[PDB]
Amino acid sequence: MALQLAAHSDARSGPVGSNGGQFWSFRPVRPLNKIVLSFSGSPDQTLNLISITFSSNPTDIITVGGVGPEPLTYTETVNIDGDIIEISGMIANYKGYNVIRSIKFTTNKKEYGPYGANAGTPFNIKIPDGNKIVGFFGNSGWYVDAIGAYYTAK
Amino acid sequence: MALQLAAHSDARSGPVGSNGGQFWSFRPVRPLNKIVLSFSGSPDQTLNLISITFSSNPTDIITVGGVGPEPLTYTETVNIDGDIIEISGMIANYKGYNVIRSIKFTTNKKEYGPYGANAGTPFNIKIPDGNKIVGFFGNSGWYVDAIGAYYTAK
Amino acid sequence: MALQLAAHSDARSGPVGSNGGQFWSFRPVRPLNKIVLSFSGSPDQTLNLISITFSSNPTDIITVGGVGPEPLTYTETVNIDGDIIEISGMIANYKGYNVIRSIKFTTNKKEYGPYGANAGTPFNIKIPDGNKIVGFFGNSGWYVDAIGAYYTAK
Amino acid sequence: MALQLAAHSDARSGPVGSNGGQFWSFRPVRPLNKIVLSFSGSPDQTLNLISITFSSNPTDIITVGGVGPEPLTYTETVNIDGDIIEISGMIANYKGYNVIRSIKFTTNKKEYGPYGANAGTPFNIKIPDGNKIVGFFGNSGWYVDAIGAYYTAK
Ligand SMILES: CO[C@H]1O[C@H](CO)[C@H](O)[C@H](O)[C@H]1O
Ligand SMILES: CO[C@H]1O[C@H](CO)[C@H](O)[C@H](O)[C@H]1O
Ligand SMILES: CO[C@H]1O[C@H](CO)[C@H](O)[C@H](O)[C@H]1O
Ligand SMILES: CO[C@H]1O[C@H](CO)[C@H](O)[C@H](O)[C@H]1O
């Protein structure tokens, strides 16, 4: 007595960047409210993006990249106001791997970034008008190798 | 030299049914305009769905199911008028496997079906208002084991 | 001129269950090592699965289901030993929705469950030999409507 | 009654390229064994990849790109022997869009190509050892904007 009412999966945009050790995915039920970027290096010189931590209130969270031995030295915290609708950045070599090196998040009312080392090959994830980004997925290893987003209407 | 503008993949609904021998996927760039359902048995008795052939003019086409030796004895040709917005049917046993046994296609203009043996466990692939089905995917072997749909805004 | 070295997304199994309010996805880069199932009702009587919390050390976590007004009364904490290789359970109606009602996790070393109300329509998420489940996805609302898994070799 | 034996969807690699008008997908149940690349331009000067026709000759076929007004002037027909294990090529601007401009296919038996214009930025779809490409997906419009592959073991 159980009708098979097909369950849905959100549209995807990307991934951009490069193949990495592990596929990762994080689409939480509630909106993303915070993104922490972790780096090695320093702002006065060059920041090396190593991992990204995505979270949604009150406790959903995931960290991708950062599984290597390099110690972190800096972090940038992005407090998301509203729905993300676009992301951009640069891809370039880091210790033998082409990785996400800088990232910028854009919502309906504000832009955050770009943060990191903004040099390299640009990437841009954009979605249809009237849609929102509701999660991210990609590949990662010691660093963040590729990134894509889940999106849906309204 | 070339912006990595993330490319999109349409949302999915399903699949419903059962795991089968091969995954299959068909999402043409022009509308799906014809579907041929091939069966063994008799329309005057019981029809057994063996394969489905989806096509989009001028020459896009795919057949899933039917790789077994059983001869086909009857076909139902469905000429699609309008956007497909819903699919439903029944899943039941056929020669050792739970398979898609009947299927009904609903568009914004007409309803087609159910075609086949309308007995078993019901399935229904429904999408949000304002969207349309633009492709199908599933699993198949000798028969049609599972089916799901790709959908996007109209 | 970063090479576009196509990045991979793991093979998927499912989902099973039914369409729900939101799509959710959680595939961490480290192994899933803990799953908390939250229920209303009681073990001595009938346990009603409401939400599931998946986590991977040290800090990855996600909770799906549980959005509604019903208070939680019991939880089953599963400490996963080994790679998850199979999941099974039952789907049945709960307050007007067909939902995941029980779930059993099988790793290469032990099995856990089934936990919940083991009655209704059985489901089984199986993968090819030599593979392991590395994440889960599905639909959820007030309850856990559908679930599927990400899997990969080894 | 029907046991919900979760059905599987093959792993994906990509897409590489750029977002385009429509998502397309083709994963036939029989091995892909024919690919036709259609161009405008001159084999001596520069070829402009307009569309690609993939087939599981002779039953399954799809053509992506080429829905615009530009006439084709030259085609490359590729008869694949064995399993495709890798593809690579260049991406570059064509009349306002960054599109797939050349492609080279590698099977366990031999190499095919490159076919197209050798200029732009490179892409490469590689898969795990012991796997094979069993389908393709991407974005397209007047041209082939993005491409990715479905792969599985064996
Ligand atoms: C140091 O190698 C590891 O990290 C890099 C960069 O992130 C890649 O992901 C690679 O596949 C993984 O094995
Ligand atoms: C006859 O077996 C074959 O066809 C059935 C039914 O379609 C399933 O797909 C199975 O996995 C496949 O090996
Ligand atoms: C009370 O409705 C909500 O919860 C149910 C059950 O979980 C479904 O998810 C539904 O789509 C969602 O809107
Ligand atoms: C001429 O525009 C059309 O073709 C280009 C190139 O293929 C892109 O697909 C674009 O989105 C589509 O509208």
Residue numbers in the entry:
A (entry chain A), B (entry chain C), C (entry chain B), D (entry chain D): 1 to 154
Article passage:
The monomeric IPO from residues 1 to 154 shows a typical β-prism fold found in the JRL family, with 12 β-sheets (β3-β14) and 2 additional short, extended, N-terminal β-strands (β1-β2). Four IPO protomers form a compact tetrameric association by swapping their extended N termini from residues 1 to 10.
The 4 IPO–Me-Gal molecules shown in Figure 1D form the same tetrameric association as that of IPO–Me-Glc. In the structure IPO–Me-Gal, 10 hydrogen bonds are formed by the same residues Gly21, Tyr97, Gly141, Trp142, Tyr143, and Asp145 of IPO. The atom C7 of Me-Gal is shown in the Me…π interaction with Trp142 of IPO. The KA values for Me-Gal and Me-Glc were 4.09×103 M−1 and 2.01×103 M−1, respectively.
